[PDB]
Structure formats: C-alpha cells, structure tokens
C-alpha cells in the first residue's frame, strides 16, 4: 500500500503532462497513450526484486 500510493501518483503525473502537450496544440488529447503501463508493472516488480522500498532514482 505504501508503494502503490507513490506508483499511482507517478502515473497521474504522466497523464498530466500528456494532457498538456495536447491541449496546447489546441487539438484533443487521448488517455490510452497517456497511461504509462510501466509505472505500476515495473515499480512493483522492481521493489519486490531488489528490495529497495522506493523509486529506482532515489533508491539510496
């Protein structure tokens, strides 16, 4: 649960920038490409693998 909080926050940061880059063009934005699958799937799989209870870039 401690993980999944941070990992879900990361993906809301992704869909954010992806909505932005797309509205500014004045076009329309699509969430299917915005949804970065590799946040959960890899974060979990990472922390459960190394043992480091965090993100990979702040793992120290």
């Amino acid at each position: 649960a401690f993980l999944f909080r941070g990992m879900f926050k990361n993906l809301l940061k992704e869909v954010r920038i992806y909505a932005q880059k797309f509205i500014d063009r004045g076009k329309d934005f699509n969430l299917e490409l915005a949804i970065k699958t590799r946040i959960i799937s890899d974060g979990l799989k990472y922390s459960l693998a190394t043992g480091n209870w965090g993100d990979q870039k702040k793992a120290h």
Partner: protein
Amino acid sequence: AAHVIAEDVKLLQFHVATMVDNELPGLPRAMQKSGRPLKSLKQRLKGKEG
C-alpha cells in the same frame, strides 16, 4: 558574457572538484544515469577498502 562564463566556470568548478572528492557538505553529488554516485579518486583511497 560575464554571467554565461560564470555559469561555465562554476559548473567547471563543480566537475573538477567532484573528480577528486564526491562528498561535499551542502553540495550536489556526482551520479551516473545508472543510478549511483561516482567513485572519485579520494573514494579509491579513503575507506577501509581503498
């Protein structure tokens, strides 16, 4: 220009200073994009394993 040259020599000051010693008080640390701090020359001879 003085401002852009100051940025060049300060960041130059950072890289040259971090080469010998990668443990400064109140200073960012040299790290690889591979997610680890660089072993400076001082780190090759500081510790029990150097």
